[model samples]
Target chain A: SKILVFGHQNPDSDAIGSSVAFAYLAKEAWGLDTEAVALGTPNEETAYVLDYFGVQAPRVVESAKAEGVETVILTDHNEFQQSISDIKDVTVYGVVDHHRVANFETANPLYMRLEPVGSASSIVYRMFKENGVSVPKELAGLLLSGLISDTLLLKSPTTHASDIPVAKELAELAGVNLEEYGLEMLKAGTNLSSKTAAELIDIDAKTFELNGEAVRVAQVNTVDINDILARQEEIEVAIQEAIVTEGYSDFVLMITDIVNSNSEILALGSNMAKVEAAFEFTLENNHAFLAGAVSRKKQVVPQLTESYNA
Target chain B: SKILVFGHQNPDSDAIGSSVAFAYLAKEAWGLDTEAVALGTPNEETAYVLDYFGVQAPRVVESAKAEGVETVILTDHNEFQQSISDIKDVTVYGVVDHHRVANFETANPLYMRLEPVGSASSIVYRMFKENGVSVPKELAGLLLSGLISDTLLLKSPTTHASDIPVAKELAELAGVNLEEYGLEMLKAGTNLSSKTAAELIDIDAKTFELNGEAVRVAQVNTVDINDILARQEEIEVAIQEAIVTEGYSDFVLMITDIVNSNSEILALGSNMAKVEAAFEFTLENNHAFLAGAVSRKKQVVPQLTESYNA
Candidate 1:
């Protein structure tokens, strides 16, 4: 059976890069028939890497439904809430991911490779070496793109020592200057004025099932924090619809300033008290600026997870 | 809170080895008081590794009750049924394993690294590199012991290409020749003539609850498969006793010849036909020879699990 590989919706650099690398590894190392698909359209930063490598972005599938395929391998995520809608019925062969595990269950034993490093692409890179699959120059650049975006060019708190050598080697293999290309690529995604309020909040959103209740955390980055807050009312209405249609019990919109490394959250829903309690700041008029907050994975998700579990 | 590190019961080389290495890491890097404990006494192979390094085996604790502790980090395992009796009562701070995840659920977010590599020692070795901790000579020996034992000196199919470099680096740092040390250590464990049938059968046994039925698989290696099969009747009696007392629906005892890479199985269970169906060979008088059957993780457990699921 041919296996399908994909990441979560609103695919980022790490998501798109990992899916591609895993497909290459699977075919070369294990001789498995595979196709890398995308759950949604790649962002401008991810598209840049694909175009630079001269490879088309994987065909997109809105639903996690496979007609003839009996098995799928997930990269960058494991939660069904963020996966294709029919993930519960599909056979999950394996997962190569870098995230917190929640509401994950499989009937049979499968291959799982997880690391706490900043990017799933880095994990896939290690797997390539582990499997004796030689990475081409273009694949190296795609892998490098994910690492730069996730760790913000080794500036995010999520960055680990393991990433530095990997980043250097990947840059050399990809034939690009590390600092120059990294800054240019990151700056490409930070251009937020072109997107609508609906598109902005959905850029990098994730859903979680905490204690049987749905929680959605949507995040967007901008150079100036006030620029996003000026359109807060418009974003708030979209979040309200997400609660009704999406059935999310709580929604947290983190407007993080990429340059300033801070965020102002607009929180709403039934479990909004937990959000205020997590940061110990009252949400005056549905907003509060958090100083020195950057990474959602390290700064936001775990705190909300711990608060809900408490 | 002090962290208690442990693996499954009837501690093997990998179980005892990873606990020691992870405890060493947690204390040196994190500045926390940590102690490595074992659920049971180490087998002869693990005992030899510890004595060779001039280190004592960790103190054994029958129950996972931490009197004054709140958190415990599990290595080499994640299943609660394989863990301490009071595993549900304690907080699992983290897990580093290479096993399938089933019946695994945690309330809060925890640091988990589950790689599909050959051994937990290899995973912990990378963690040491990731954390910037230098691998001491004795610890390197311990890590090598785990990898050598688990993968049968890189002969098992579970062995990954990642393991070769790690094993080489560990041997160099531990100041031992890889080929010579690995063979000698493995040959030492194959000396099983002295033990009683009960002790021999229980040398490396694991119980799995598959499809609501308890399935127990035990494995022992010898230079000559016939040497272990000579005591087959005695081993069968023990299997029958375990089924009655432990409520096991099936018990499969494999006597493997490490040198020849073949296994003579003593299958005794209510679902004995399922074993024959899985392996495509009928057991004459509840016994059969399996060619190239070395890894219980890859061949035995997975097949039995799929049979039950089917």
Candidate 2:
């Protein structure tokens, strides 16, 4: 742990993106024995960064071997999962993340920040701003990747007012236009497969709601999806049955054309009393905001949840 | 079973208050489900909206027992727990939400939307604009709730470029002054208990991060308390330590003060890195303003997260 810093499970763009940027800052600027680690194989979007920057987070390691790590610095993650390192003997030194809050014990002589912004890389760039931490172009691209993935190109809910300026700086430092970089990265995630509907469903994550009832929600993402759009009629029909087959009270299967960038949402009802009114937009036009229609965690999910109750 | 509609859980003002307005609209306009079921208890802010209309969402039955009813239309709630009734045979007819595409299923007549605006009630107001849609003062209040809640009284990142006009139209339709109404609503949700640090934590339905090495992050929200200006030190320390006990790598809390019909936010964090450099505001006396802080979701979180990455 003393030799490296890592992020959490699934290694989202922000996790890997931020780690790569910060690792460069540490190694290049601070001259530390820091390696950036990804918990697992990177996702479609993150793969774009690896290809573009020709860099990857440090290899993943079991949480247990980290026991000898007396000073593990965690980034984009706040808790220990097998992804960062598992050994209890490891003393957590520094934490750098942008998530909300959790009920976990934290150690001191540590660094932490909680920003409601979209990516952890923005924080890294800021360190350069105030503390004069510097990042190379490859690492700069990594920082931009986190911002692009988290902000949907500055259109996501989690975007910070500060990210625009910082992102501008990082993009310039990376020697790429922000818009061009985003278009390229999103296109990387848009490769569609002829997977079965079940497999397509598997491509997304499932959220089980246990607050008052047991409800499940699943979310998936893709870039410019011409194939899914051409077969919209069939997808809607099949998704209807998937609602029941999946045993969800209600279900919404959306196609977010990330490269082209708009959302075509298909929904079915086991019970939609809560969201029926707002669903009116489903038929009016299978789209909303060419620019703002990405990132479920940052954009669409929060609005849907609030509207369901409104 | 067909007697009424319902509200939402954690009934923030926009949730239950909007329910009251919609229930009134059902009778005053559509003449259906006058006894609309209000699903949960109202939070402090919503209680004012209920009293403003002198009506409440009908607690017709336990949500599970709400099954006997057919066509249960809801105002806000996308997931099962928000609905709380997983009745197999119930007909969930409609929904009104302002969030992203949800994972809920609907019937043939479903009307769901994932409008990237401030509130669900605003969507209902849009329905009223359909020439013959009934416009009522109560409904106006609910729409106002959506704006207030989502915007922190009109300062959220998700506030549509068009919401300002929409909010104004709804106010005129209802013949109520927006400023006065918003003031009353914001005051209701302010309950600052200094005795316990967890009170601040308990009251916030924010998010958190758990990274390997036991680091966590959290975000909390609140209305501005002019009276507590003197106790800023106490408030900051309480929040900083509260997140420490909860085991967060970082903490970002926002205290939005509603004044002059606008929002001013106070952000507190445990670490410089945690601050995410997302919020770039200079204190002008006691007020903190993003040089151009507008839109809660889009501007704040993105910047915060970008900077939080060490």
Candidate 3:
């Protein structure tokens, strides 16, 4: 039976890149019949990465059973709430992730490799070396792009010391200058001028089940924070609609300035006090400025999780 | 400040072997302050292994927090119920396991390496090589014993193709004759003459919460099945007391014959029908003969889990 390899919902560059690259690695090293699929269509950053590498974006899959897949391999994410709708039904053959483990369980022993590194791509790159499998040029490009996207060109706090060499090596294998390619790929995703308020929020979002409350967290990067704040009224309305329709207890949006490594946090939730307490910042007009907060995984989720639990 | 490395309760060969070896590797490779500990004292087989290797058994630890440790690494098991009493309160630094993942979660990203191999010792051996850390002769002996114990000297169906080479390499490093040493070790564990029925059942047992029912499964090795069955009346009484006191809905015991590679499934539980359905056998006198059922992991738990869930 073919096994589906995928990442979290609303797939971003790291999600698509790591899944596709890992699928190829699994096929070559283990000789498994695997297909790289995505829970959602590629975001602008991933699309740019795919085009630059001359690789096709993985086909979107809504359900594993629908495609006659009984087993799956997860990458970049492990939370069930961030996975496929029927994730609980299928057997998880393996997981290669770089996120907190929660709401995840398997009925059988599996091959799981997780690391507290910058990205799943960094771990996959290490696996490639361990298995003595050569990474193809396009796959190398995708993996390098994944690390670049997740660590914000190795400038985010989430970047590990080990990730520096991984980025350098993958860039060498992919035959691309790291800094130039990274900037271009990140900038490509920031072209959100044409997106609707709903689309912008959904570009890179995940639902976290925090202390029995479903909190929706989303991030969108731009060169300037003012460009996102200009659309705050429309974004707030869209966020409210999503909360009601999706039954979310809270909705938190991060309008990140890629240039300055800052974020304007816009939140609307039943637990506004908890959200404010998470960052230790007061909200002015339903928003607060967070300096030097670029990586959501490193800066946002853990804080919010602890606060919610407390 | 220090990370405690341990296996599941009722520490078996794989649990102690993997924990001790991984603690050494973590210290050498990552420079972490790690101490190897065990939840319980070693069984006869593992005691023999430690003696043969000229290594001391790890000190027993009841609580991580009591030792002023805030983080821990787990081996051999991932189920929370099988872990430390205060597992939920501390941080999980990592896990190196060879069992199905259940009731395990971490608040942050961690280093987890799991494989569907015969033993956690096998996975630890691979990590030692990956990190370019040479295993001491004593550690190699313990690891070899772990693989032998878990796979019934590479005879169990749970033994993976990868595990054969691991056993061979570890045996060579330990400078032991594989078959000769393995048989002696297997025989060492089967000496149940000195054990009471309660002690025998408690030697190697785990609690599995399936479908909201706490099922207690225990295993004991014997050269002859009749030897174990002779004490069935006493064992039954002990089982009943345990079920009542521990609040376990079911108690299943596997009297494994190392020589024949078979088992006698003795069970007393609230759901006898479900237990019988799990193996598709009729229980005569609260016991059923299971041919070639040496592995509780590969042959028993998965089937029981499915039956209970169904």
Candidate 4:
């Protein structure tokens, strides 16, 4: 009985790094036969982190049953709509995550360790220390990258107090200067020139079922907000195509400026009122400025969920 | 804001013990404004345990909002149907439990610590040690009783290998002999002569939504299974009444013999075929013998869930 460990689709650095580090820890400590996989290939930030640590990108998988694994462990995310396609058909052995729990159910008791922290990698690193299993330098490098990317190098409001010490310790173990390496890795992800309008929006997007409506939320990080806003016409066209083909009732995209800690939200959908209500801003030219909004998990999704339900 | 801590509807020893102990720990270690409460009054065994430990039973409340608490922490259970009324309206701050996770969702990332162990008390004790919070003598007594009750004094199959040392350590700290106190407490719960058939079935029961059908599963411990089966006629009548009044699709009661580790299952419902299919046995005179079936959590609920789904 092998276990597949993975994260959400449109895999980000936290999703890739946490699954790899947890798979190694599970094999070393619990002696379980686990292989790290991803629902999608690595995004730019994750690819840069993996290459820097000398680690390979996890093998991509679309379903657990297709790989002959009946039990799976999820990291970084839990919403079933954002998970592997055949998630309902298999057993969830455990979950190590740092997101709101929704549309997830298991038939048996499992090893679930969740916390209100910056990233799933933070929780995984805490477990490594709790089990007295030392983290390898490469894994530590990846884990540290996960925390930095999720929290915008510990500058986002989503960063918990506990994560600060964890980031420092992981940075020391990984043998890298926190500020220099973090900025370098983040800068690599902002090179969106090579991506098409469709690919840019799909890089780190998740679909959420909000109040019986399918709402697709996508996020992209940048050094300057104006650069992404300049391509707003093509991005909105791509979002319109996605809504019709994917059967989504609404779509919202957050273009976040990591340096300024702000986001420009571009929204398009049938439920325009709810979208406008979520951020308390009128869409001028189909987009609006969202000040001091960087973390989608903390600053965007919950507000949308509340407004949609209301 | 204050947080309310409680367990499932039919408050067993584990539910009462774990909630009280966890509330104390949260207040002492984390400095949370917490109160221990119960969804239902203590059963015979829990009452006996509380009296033995010189601890009062937690006050029963039907809903969290009624008490002006919008946040709650669940212990020993996670299913929303088995939790407080208006559970869906409040936020679940945390859950410390050892049961299958179903029908539970939270809007925010929470402190969830779930293990497939014998009892939630075992996890609470482990956390106490991890945080260097010494367990008081009375709380230790209640925790030990919870472990002994849920695992049938560590003889049930649901007992994990990790639970053995936890029970021993709790017994030592509570200043009670493990075997002697456990036997006495268990014997106190077997006093079913005073209860009517309706009361007997409702004492330790839970409702599970299996494949869109509400199935009521109840358990009653006894020294001799034959004595309980002798009253099968009246019990069947009471179960029929409950099915009609409570709208249960099926009703299955387990009359267990603690000494022999066996059960005589009395079933009455529209879906009797599925009930029999769960255990792979034919019912004779409205009942069947299930060998070495002491735990409903491990042996009964999972089987029934699988059969109903199948």
Instruction: Judging by lDDT, tell me the better candidate of 2 and 3.
Output: 3
Q: For residues A114-176, write the lDDT of model 1, one tens digit per residue.
A: 667889998899878866778999999999999998888888888888899999999999999
TM-score of 2: 0.42
| Tens-place lDDT digits, model 4, residues A168-280 | 89999999999989999999899999899999989989999998999999999888888888887898789999999999998998998888888999988899999999888
Instruction: Please write out the lDDT profile of model 2 over residues B1-310, one tens digit for every residue.
Output: 3545665544566666555556666566656755655545555556666677665544645754545555666665554434645533354555566532222443222323334456766666665654266665666656676677667657665566667887787767656787777666676666554334444533433343322322222223344445455556665677667556766555544444544233344444345434424555554433364443443345554454345543
- The residue pairs in collision within model 1 are none
Please state the error at residue A190 of candidate 1 in Å. 3.9
lDDT score, residue B38, model 4?
92
Q: Mind giving the per-residue lDDT tens digits that candidate 4 earns over B222-304?
A: 99987888888889889999999999998999999999899999998889999999999989978999999998888998898
Colliding residue pairs in candidate 3: none
Q: For residue B213, give model 4's deviation from the true position in Å.
A: 1.2
The CA lDDT at A236 in model 3 is 91
CAPRI classification of candidate 2: incorrect
- Which is the winner by TM-score between candidate 1 and candidate 3? 3
lDDT of 3 by residue, B1-310 (tens): 6899999999999899999998999999989999999998899999899998889999999797789888999999989999999998899989999988889887789999999998999999998998899999989999999999999999888889999889879899999999999999988899999799989999989999989999999999999899889999999999999999999999999999889888999998889998998998999999999988988788888998899989
Off by over 4 Å in 3: none
lDDT of 2 by residue, A100-157 (tens): 2222233212234434467777877776655476566777888888888777788765
Worst 10 residues of 4 chain B by lDDT: B100-109
lDDT of 2: 0.56
